[PDB]
Paper text:
The X-linked neuroligin 3 ([name]) gene encodes the postsynaptic adhesion molecule [name], which interacts with presynaptic neurexins (NRXNs) to organize synaptogenesis. Here, we identified a non-canonical synapse-organizing interaction between [name] and [name]δ splice variants lacking the meB peptide, which competed with NRXNs by steric hindrance. To elucidate the structural mechanism of the [name]–[name]δ-meB(–) interaction, we determined the crystal structures of mouse apo-[name] ECD (residues 35–684) at 2.76 Å resolution and [name] ECD in complex with [name]δA3B– Ig1–Fn1 at 3.85 Å resolution.
Consequently, [name]δA3B– and [name] form a W-shaped complex with a 2:2 stoichiometry. The Ig1–Ig3 domains of [name]δ interact extensively with the α/β-hydrolase-fold core of [name]. In addition, the C-terminal tail of [name] ECD lies on the meA3 insertion in [name]δ Ig2. The binding site of [name] for [name]δ Ig3 overlaps with the (potential) NRXN-binding site. The bound [name]δ Ig3 covers Gln370–Asp377.
Residue numbers in the entry:
A (entry chain B): 37 to 147, 174 to 554, 568 to 615
B (entry chain A): 28 to 413
Amino acid sequence: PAPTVNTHFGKLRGARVPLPSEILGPVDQYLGVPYAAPPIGEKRFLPPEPPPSWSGIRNATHFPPVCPQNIHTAVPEVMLPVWFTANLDIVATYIQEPNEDCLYLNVYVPTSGAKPVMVYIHGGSYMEGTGNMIDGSVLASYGNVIVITLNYRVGVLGFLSTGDQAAKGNYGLLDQIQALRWVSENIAFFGGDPRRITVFGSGIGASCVSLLTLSHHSEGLFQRAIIQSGSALSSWAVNYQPVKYTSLLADKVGCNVLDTVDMVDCLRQKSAKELVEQDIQPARYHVAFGPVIDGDVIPDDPEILMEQGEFLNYDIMLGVNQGEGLKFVEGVVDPEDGVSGTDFDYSVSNFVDNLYGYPEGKDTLRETIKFMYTDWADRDNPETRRKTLVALFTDHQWVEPSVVTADLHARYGSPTYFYAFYHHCQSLMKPAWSDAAHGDEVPYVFGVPMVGPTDLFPCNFSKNDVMLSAVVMTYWTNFAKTGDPNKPVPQDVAWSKYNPRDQLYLHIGLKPRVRDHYRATKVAFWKHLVPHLYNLHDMF
Amino acid sequence: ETPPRFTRTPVDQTGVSGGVASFICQATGDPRPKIVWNKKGKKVSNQRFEVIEFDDGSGSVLRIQPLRTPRDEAIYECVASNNVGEISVSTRLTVLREDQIPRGFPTIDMGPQLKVVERTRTATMLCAASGNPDPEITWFKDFLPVDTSNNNGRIKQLRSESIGALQIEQSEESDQGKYECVATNSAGTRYSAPANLYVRVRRVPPRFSIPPTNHEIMPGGSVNITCVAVGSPMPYVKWMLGAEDLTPEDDMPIGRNVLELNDVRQSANYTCVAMSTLGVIEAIAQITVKALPKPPGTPVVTESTATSITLTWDSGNPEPVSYYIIQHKPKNSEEPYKEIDGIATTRYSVAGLSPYSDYEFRVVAVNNIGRGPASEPVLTQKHHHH
Ligand SMILES: *[C@@H]1O[C@H](CO)[C@@H](O)[C@H](O)[C@H]1NC(C)=O
Ligand SMILES: *[C@@H]1O[C@H](CO)[C@@H](O)[C@H](O)[C@H]1NC(C)=O
Ligand SMILES: *[C@@H]1O[C@H](CO)[C@@H](O)[C@H](O)[C@H]1NC(C)=O
Ligand SMILES: *[C@@H]1O[C@H](CO)[C@@H](O)[C@H](O)[C@H]1NC(C)=O
């Protein structure tokens, strides 16, 4: 009894699979659904087009090819989640055999009325990662909603930009725009509601979700969004030197000429795997291939667009984890789990070198930072010194851009909800002294403890993890269903609405509570005090 | 006609392998002297060789990218000619490897940055470089040198003791393009990769972001409806009935103003008004309460039996009707009509009637909205004699 679903491009045969938990019902899934034309040959480096139609019943039983990527090549480890980097061998099972024809998605249907739709966009880095590694079957059956995991052009193929008509760039985000267009017109057959679509991403993917809300094209596609440990305001969110790294790649493949047109046509002649095998190391804590400002998809600065009110239409839920910048200090930590004073001052000096690029009066900010993140209640503590040093990278890269995004959205009474994750699972993937790192909220959103330890998450969960994950899944589905995390299914705790004056957030953890002004002492430091010491523009 | 005269002869440059080299050659005369670049090199290319003609027809800028030793290193001449004369000037290029670069050579400290600026506000492109001797700062806009010799124009050359940059006072669409800076002294010339500049900014009249959508519910059923308006600067959002403002105006919100409909009774056209210093917009909402059906058409007696009567009637309503209620009773009796319920067709035969008795039949249209007015009645004539 295979399930049959009609679409605007042909019929698809899926499979009814029951979940291992007796409490959760069976779900219908349809894998490898083409939502756009193959971006090969001439379609390469071009906006996505609608997919070709098929006459018969197309098999949606096997996995589709992933986009060209390579994890063994040197990529910035700090951007990737730790569960990705701790198990590189397990991840390699999903990345094997990549093909340029990779524009396919996956849908999950739980089996009254139209069912809400949730669209996921995973982002390890802007070069790797895929939605196939995440199984949203638990979130589908638990919340009676539709979970969608997709793939999109990544790396050079999805973000090559020459800043002119030869290669506008932002091809990866356009694939996510095309997917949501196809989902909006074809999910009604799956029993889904196109008006209750909630796109949600994590990590770099959450940075992608933030960009889509600012796009002019996403107007009538979705209505809600959930951003998890990502932002369009980080240093790696937008590439502000794309022509430089693009021309460096063209010299590596030999296609570097003077006309940007002659070299783009030259690149399409090259194979898609020769471009990925090439390694390009950008400026540290910056991205070499990513989204650009093209004057169309991203017309202006992201923060500039937020003041315009572009994304006030959609209901927004966002938040960050406790210790996101684990890999920053992990190399400096001694075998005694401590950071020395010389190592602390050294790591702080490295921070000012990379992000701010040697301004005049730079020595003023090194000692200002060292004063801010030093617990004067315990000056000589090496472990506390490690604790505040992780909070340094965590505040500036994730916490600062997230609060600025939440204030610019809740500025005019638009529905906004903010959370803070303070719980992580226990395994050998990450050291025990470390807290919730990048991508640690992913399992609790999809209900991984409901199934147990997996090949990708060898964590040893407890009964408190299943209770917490069911709470998290209920908040997510409730928000995707009604725009309110508390309606219609209550918790068996009330999540208050966020506004820039009260700044009410939800402390997510084994002791769920509601506090105010999350880390607000450090937030105003980076937003108000830091730029004024960077505004040495008095010479002009 | 005037023979061509050189106005800006090319100077010999010295570029880096993998970089750029730009020569400048301009002339004047009558007619316009066309320029032909004739490289006298043993190895010639075409993909790197691109000539960029000036937008005003003065001269052309030869560009070679990327520089590769020793093929690009040759002698280049600028032949400006017309149908009156012919002149030529040669310049030399010097391309060296990555290691031949000595101490104090022009090194780009900070390259040009991506930036977006306002139409009338000041645009500033920054570029830092250091060398021994101190190199000279020159900018290139779309493979063309940036002319900043005139101080009266909007474009100005910022030159501080530390570093100099480029400043634009009032921006136009012309400024939108690729900008690249490069340092040059007696040692050589080393470029930095370009940085695109965009000039489009925030001062747009308000637009309806979430327009009010019309609805229909049974009267009484309260509902919270949303109207959102965006733009820079953010406009005041006001709900208006068309005569009086529903909002207190004193503390009217900005950006979003959801309207609460209490004690829904009659339909009405609501108007969400969003006004700003730039413009004012209006949006209408067709709030329509579900109305009752009009009385059906007059029925007609089709079949006249002694104990039964068949009737056919018109719906009388442009909207569909759920069912029809037949109301039968004696002619002049003041008794409440005995009603037949559940009739799903426009024709029904009433059974059980006592013979030779004049009856009165009424058809009732009822939908999900409620029971509409009764149709017009009729009478038939059956008579028996004893
Ligand atoms: C789909 O797969 C089944 C077996 O899994 C096979 O019998 C059938 O022919 C396939 N159909 C198509 C259109 O490939
Ligand atoms: C694995 O689970 C056991 C519970 O039986 C726990 O004691 C142990 O700490 C877990 N492993 C790690 C690495 O935490
Ligand atoms: C008014 O809008 C709020 C939005 O949170 C909603 O909770 C409430 O139910 C609405 N009231 C009515 C009467 O619909
Ligand atoms: C709304 O306006 C239209 C045309 O302006 C008019 O025909 C209609 O009757 C109005 N509706 C109400 C409820 O006044």
